[PDB]
């Protein structure tokens, strides 16, 4: 199934597939964390788990949520330094678009440009194709909320509910079963479903000090991060 250096660089194997991109998808799961993004009627939420193994570490600087722009929110999965570089690149691109064209950049154009940048690595053979994922959420006029996903292969798509990490398949199946019912979603309902999907996939019944929640809604499009008190209130409301 190999002929030459098709196992070592990005060239076509005799069967028509190149393995160096499939290896990054396995490299994504090295971290061991799972994140979910849900879209509602007039809001969008991101939920992620975070673990601090020891008390020596400073727990205030292990966040996996980043703020690219005052209206656009993001979350990463996989390697850390690659995600940091990608976030830096995204911030630069958003600032450049705003300066050059005089109005805020739509989320879909940003995701398309990020995928276009990340597609070159699988074309030239002198570089490694940045094995980390990308999830973006935002609000946009005339369309409402939007959630977008981008993967290292140079591919992107818009969604209504997404999960990325080690437990992608089970959470995807749960979200599909839930969304087939076609029930109208509100703020509390979206947050509750987002929390319960992770809770039932992991079977942990976690405390309010090991999750991160980010929200956006049509009353103040500013991206904001929930505090611990609000998370505790949501958790106690969830369990009757």
């Amino acid at each position: 199934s190999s002929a030459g250096f098709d196992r070592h660089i990005t060239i076509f194997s005799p069967e028509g597939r190149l393995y160096q991109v499939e290896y990054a998808f396995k490299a994504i799961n090295q971290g061991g964390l799972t994140s979910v993004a849900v879209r509602g009627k007039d809001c969008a939420v991101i939920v992620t788990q975070k673990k601090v193994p020891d008390k020596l570490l400073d727990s205030s600087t292990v966040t996996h949520l980043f703020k690219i722009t005052e209206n656009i929110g993001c979350v990463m999965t996989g390697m850390t330094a690659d995600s940091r570089s990608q976030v830096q690149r995204a911030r630069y691109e958003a600032a450049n678009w705003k300066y050059k064209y005089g109005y805020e950049i739509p989320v879909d154009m940003l995701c398309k440009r990020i995928a276009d940048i990340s597609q070159v690595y699988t074309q030239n053979a002198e570089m490694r194709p940045l094995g980390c994922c990308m999830i973006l959420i935002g609000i946009d006029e005339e369309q409402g909320p939007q959630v977008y996903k981008c993967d290292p292969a140079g591919y992107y798509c818009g969604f209504k509910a997404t999960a990325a990490g080690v437990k992608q398949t089970e959470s995807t199946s749960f979200l599909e079963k839930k969304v087939k019912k076609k029930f109208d979603w509100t703020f509390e309902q979206t947050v509750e479903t987002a929390i319960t999907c992770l809770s039932t996939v992991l079977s942990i019944d976690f405390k309010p000090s090991e999750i991160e929640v980010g929200v956006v809604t049509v009353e103040n499009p500013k991206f904001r991060i929930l505090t611990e008190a609000e998370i505790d209130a949501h958790l106690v409301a969830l369990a009757e």
Partner: protein, 69 residues
Amino acid sequence: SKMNLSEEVDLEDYVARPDKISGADINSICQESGMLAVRENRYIVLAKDFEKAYKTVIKKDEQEHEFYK
């Protein structure tokens, strides 16, 4: 044709699924649904039993990287 399948069971749903199941595991689906209905101390099989049994038996994840095409 031998077990109960009272009134609200839809079989055209499960036939429509792809993934080429063989002939020796459809019997396994029916057997597992019957066992699951036995567990609940009930002698009538419902649709949830078929749903759970079909979800459990097949167990194929994706193997289908989406940038093939």
